[PDB]
Amino acid sequence: KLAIEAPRGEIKDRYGRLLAGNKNLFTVQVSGNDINKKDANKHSRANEISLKLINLLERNGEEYVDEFPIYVENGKYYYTYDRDIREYKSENGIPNDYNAKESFYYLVDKLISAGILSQEDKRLDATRLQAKLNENGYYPPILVSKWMFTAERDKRDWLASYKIKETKLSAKEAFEKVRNSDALEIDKSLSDEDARKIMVVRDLIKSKGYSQYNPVTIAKDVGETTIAQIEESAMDLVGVSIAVEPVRYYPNGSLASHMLGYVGKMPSTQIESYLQKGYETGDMVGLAGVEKSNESRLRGTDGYKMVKSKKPKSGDTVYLTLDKDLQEVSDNALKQIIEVASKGGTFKSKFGDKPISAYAGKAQSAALIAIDVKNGEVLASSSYPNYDPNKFAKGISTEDYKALQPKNPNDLLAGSPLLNLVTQGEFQPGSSFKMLTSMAALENGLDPNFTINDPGVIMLGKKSFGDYVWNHGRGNHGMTNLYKAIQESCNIYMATIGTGKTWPDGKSIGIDMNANKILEYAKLFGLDQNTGLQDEVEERAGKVPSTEDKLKSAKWSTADTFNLAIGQGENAYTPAQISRYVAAIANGGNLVELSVVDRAVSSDYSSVKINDQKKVEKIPFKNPDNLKELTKGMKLVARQGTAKSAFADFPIDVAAKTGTAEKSGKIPTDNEYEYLKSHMSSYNVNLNDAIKLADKMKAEKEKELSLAKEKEIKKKLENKDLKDEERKKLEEELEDGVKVRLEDTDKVNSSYLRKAIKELNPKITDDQIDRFKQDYGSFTWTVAFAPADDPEIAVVCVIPQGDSSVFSLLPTREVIGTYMGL
Ligand SMILES: *C(=O)[C@@H](NC(=O)[C@H](N)c1ccccc1)[C@@H]1N[C@@H](C(=O)O)C(C)(C)S1
Numbered sequence: 001k002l003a004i005e006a007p008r009g010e011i012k013d014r015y016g017r018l019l020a021g022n023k024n025l026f027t028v029q030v031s032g033n034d035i036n037k038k039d040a041n042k043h044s045r046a047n048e049i050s051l052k053l054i055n056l057l058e059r060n061g062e063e064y065v066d067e068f069p070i071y072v073e074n075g076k077y078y079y080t081y082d083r084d085i086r087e088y089k090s091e092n093g094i095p096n097d098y099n100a101k102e103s104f105y106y107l108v109d110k111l112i113s114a115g116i117l118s119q120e121d122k123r124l125d126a127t128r129l130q131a132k133l134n135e136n137g138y139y140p141p142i143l144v145s146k147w148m149f150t151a152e153r154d155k156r157d158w159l160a161s162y163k164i165k166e167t168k169l170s171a172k173e174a175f176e177k178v179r180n181s182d183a184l185e186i187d188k189s190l191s192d193e194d195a196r197k198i199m200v201v202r203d204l205i206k207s208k209g210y211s212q213y214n215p216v217t218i219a220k221d222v223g224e225t226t227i228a229q230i231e232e233s234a235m236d237l238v239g240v241s242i243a244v245e246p247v248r249y250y251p252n253g254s255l256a257s258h259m260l261g262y263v264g265k266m267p268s269t270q271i272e273s274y275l276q277k278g279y280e281t282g283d284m285v286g287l288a289g290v291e292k293s294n295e296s297r298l299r300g301t302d303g304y305k306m307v308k309s310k311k312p313k314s315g316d317t318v319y320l321t322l323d324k325d326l327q328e329v330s331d332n333a334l335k336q337i338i339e340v341a342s343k344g345g346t347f348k349s350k351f352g353d354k355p356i357s358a359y360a361g362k363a364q365s366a367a368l369i370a371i372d373v374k375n376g377e378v379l380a381s382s383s384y385p386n387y388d389p390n391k392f393a394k395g396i397s398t399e400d401y402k403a404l405q406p407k408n409p410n411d412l413l414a415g416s417p418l419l420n421l422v423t424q425g426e427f428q429p430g431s432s433f434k435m436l437t438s439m440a441a442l443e444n445g446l447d448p449n450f451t452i453n454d455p456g457v458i459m460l461g462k463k464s465f466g467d468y469v470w471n472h473g474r475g476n477h478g479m480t481n482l483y484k485a486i487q488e489s490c491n492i493y494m495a496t497i498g499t500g501k502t503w504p505d506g507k508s509i510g511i512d513m514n515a516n517k518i519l520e521y522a523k524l525f526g527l528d529q530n531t532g533l534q535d536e537v538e539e540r541a542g543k544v545p546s547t548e549d550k551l552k553s554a555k556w557s558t559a560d561t562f563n564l565a566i567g568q569g570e571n572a573y574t575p576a577q578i579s580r581y582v583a584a585i586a587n588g589g590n591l592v593e594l595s596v597v598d599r600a601v602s603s604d605y606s607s608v609k610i611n612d613q614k615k616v617e618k619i620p621f622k623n624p625d626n627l628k629e630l631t632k633g634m635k636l637v638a639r640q641g642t643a644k645s646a647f648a649d650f651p652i653d654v655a656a657k658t659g660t661a662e663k664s665g666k667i668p669t670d671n672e673y674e675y676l677k678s679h680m681s682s683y684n685v686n687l688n689d690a691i692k693l694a695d696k697m698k699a700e701k702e703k704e705l706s707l708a709k710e711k712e713i714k715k716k717l718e719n720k721d722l723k724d725e726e727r728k729k730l731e732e733e734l735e736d737g738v739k740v741r742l743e744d745t746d747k748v749n750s751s752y753l754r755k756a757i758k759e760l761n762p763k764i765t766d767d768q769i770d771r772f773k774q775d776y777g778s779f780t781w782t783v784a785f786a787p788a789d790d791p792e793i794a795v796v797c798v799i800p801q802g803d804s805s806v807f808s809l810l811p812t813r814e815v816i817g818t819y820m821g822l
């Protein structure tokens, strides 16, 4: 019974253009049996052929599998195992001199402090506590049982297999054992550079198991020269052969990488899982995006033979909803606005260029989605930075995935390229949320023409709330009704109808409006629900701030109402959510369930519409004609409002709202205590003096708590009728002396170091102490639907930390333009 693998189903675009398909490659395979069987010779020919093969490939410039666990970086021998531990610790802020148990709890402490666990949960059966981490999404490479790192155990089991049960820690000395090994018995005459090159092949073959099912692929892709010299030089290279193997390939490279996703190695965690589902070991699998969601479908139905014969059926071809041609525009447009904002320059546009400032340097990431407002079909979805799915095809999880794929600063809004910002970046909505505020107000009787003489600022607090024009110059909007409000983005107007009062001069207006009702409408526009993509691709949906979860643990502040009413406060939603919200305005008030997987076609050209059952459910508005006001305003934004700069001389009637959201405060560090330490000098304090003092403050608190604990125990002991067993426990506490200890978390250890800094420099502020941390920063937005009077397309474009609002409009214009067939 042999393993005949089915050809992987293709992924195509809406119109049938190949996005992901298969191609054949020449691999160099090596037979274990053949290379290292002997008859009369003491030594097999293995190490002689091994050394010959690598050198051959090396000369010809062929890339070859090298998963031998000891490397040479600068005459220094290092374990891959070990590098893997200390690289894991960096990415969580665990001090590299922490052992596995210490490393483990550090990660628990991390999440308790973060409101993900409780201080009580902190102690449990480690297995139950690991089970709490895993289901919660943190998989930390540690064996709870022996309190040791997986990759350290694997270092044991490797030295066990070459019968080196003596674990004196060594890399170069261990290399020699394995070289001069019983089971490999290399020539002592040879070079140490040559020996490793042999061990590469010898360890490959040895790691694949005892029974040695089939040959072993030593090089996954080779030129015409090698295939000649391996077939030619056949008499030397006994076990060596050429095979043809199919690989996955993405013709258009990184185009739509996140939606498509990628195939790679089974994550070793799950190998067991996949072998129970009937996969072979060498098999590649869907790891992200549609490649993963439709893994079963694309996998096909593989076949078998005996040879002591049934044909495999190929995977169904999966058609996405994306337009290959609209996707290119959106990927290219996002790529431009970041690379031009990098340094400086200008943005080229089929629809008339614009130069952009150089000092917009903080902007690294960006996202954009365009959907069919009638049926939720996702026509283009684009997140930057991104990745070439082709680099995972072969199975490069060792290094190049660790080199460039996870990124700064373990907060993904500016960071990792694997992240699909369109479905996984929760951002502050911005002022797009203003048509949502307005809708609810309109629906509580507001007259669009209600006009106010614009202060530019409310001074309800000691602190001030004001229009952007009033925050820069002494600003004003003057005579403002809803239409001018939406058109120039007046924040005051929005606060006033938000609260349904006038501040602070008259209080109530003719309408019953409040933060709860603003969130009631946010809910109705489906900002509380998953988009529809949740089961097609990786999505991390936002949640509408719960008014109910405030009460059960007073009401909403009338400055929590102000912010919330202009897309600030705890609002935080994916751009794909915002896409549905805007679609509902655009399509007369219908909440469309989004789709990115359109249909599938079998080998036998049978088809099926997958996005067939996608809810298009009518939002129960007290009067959907109200949505016509939101448009009327949104059109003025394009005609003579904030977005006039880009949309005024534009063939298409476009309804747009701009935005920019400032999220307050700093992004917390991996390790607060290390932070304070590494920044002590800049606070004009001495580390030793700071540390010493912090320890004194802790010892001072430990005493204070001991004294009180003592009083408490003595008081319990004064209680007559206190069953003996308890009286004995309370006595056994005291009987030695009570010595209370603070936990020795990072939250605690740091709390004191901070307190000590504040003493030793009595003028320094908290903000000054925290200046070196990353800012959550600003995010600049644009949402639009076209053509305004009979809309077909809704587009949403976010650039976190973009300078002007023009960065958001320019990709939204290119995409609108291209869709409309200009
Ligand atoms: C909506 O997002 C509004 N933005 C704000 O109120 C923020 N407090 C803010 C953050 C960063 C810079 C300035 C203000 C209005 N809409 C914006 C737009 O459409 O571009 C705005 C700049 C007119 S303010």
Ligand SMILES: [Zn+2]
Pocket: 454, 456, 467, 476, 477, 478, 480, 489, 490, 491, 492, 493
């Ligand atoms: Zn105003």
